[PDB]
Each structure stands twice: as structure tokens, then as C-alpha cells.
Write a protein that binds this ligand. Sequence first.
Ligand SMILES: *[C@@H]1O[C@H](CO)[C@@H](O)[C@H](O)[C@H]1NC(C)=O
Ligand SMILES: *[C@@H]1O[C@H](CO)[C@@H](O)[C@H](O)[C@H]1NC(C)=O
Lengths: 39, 49
Amino acid sequence: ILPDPSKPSKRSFIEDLLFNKVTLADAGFIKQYGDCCAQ
Amino acid sequence: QQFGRDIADTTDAVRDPQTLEILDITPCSFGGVSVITPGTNTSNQVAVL
Ligand SMILES: *[C@@H]1O[C@H](CO)[C@@H](O)[C@H](O)[C@H]1NC(C)=O
Ligand SMILES: *[C@@H]1O[C@H](CO)[C@@H](O)[C@H](O)[C@H]1NC(C)=O
């Protein structure tokens, strides 16, 4: 759970797993505008 | 097919009636005007974002 300097982001293994697990299936609106940008 | 759509029910693609090419539609860039000021009691210069 501690961050490591071997990765560009100041996260850990458990933190990156959380970000890569919660996503959207392109069935909404945030991915079209929020995450990149095309309005 | 002639022109495209998406889940948003907006036109983002079309066929050119002149030549057989596929063109995408992206709306004109826009946004809100935000004015940053330190307060009229201090200065007059402002920053626009
Ligand atoms: C913003 O404009 C620059 C022009 O120098 C371009 O290189 C860049 O790709 C543009 N950013 C976009 C389209 O997100
Ligand atoms: C703010 O405005 C008042 C007048 O309403 C003035 O007396 C004061 O000097 C100004 N500046 C401050 C409170 O730093």
C-alpha cells in the first residue's frame, strides 16, 4: 500500500488496481467529455 | 446508410454527396468565461480563464 518511486504515478499496487477496475462501458456521458479533448 | 449518430442522439458523421468520403462532425469550441479578481477593494487588474 505504500507508494513506490519505480512508477510515474505516486500510487501503490492496490491504488492502481482500484483505478483500473472502476470504469465505464461507453454507455454514458463522462467518458465522452470528462476523460480525454473533444467536447 | 447516410449519416451517423450515437447514444447521445446527435449527428457526428455524414456521407459527402459529392465524393465517397467519411467525415466526422465536431461542434465549435465553446465554454464559460471565468474572471479571476483579487477584489475591487485591493486592485483593478483581473485574469480571464
Ligand atoms: C492544441 O493545439 C496544438 C497546436 O499547436 C496541437 O498541437 C494540439 O494537438 C492541440 N490539442 C488538442 C487537439 O487536444
Ligand atoms: C476596504 O474598503 C473599505 C471601505 O468600505 C476601506 O475603508 C478599507 O480601507 C478597504 N480595505 C481593507 C479593509 O483592507
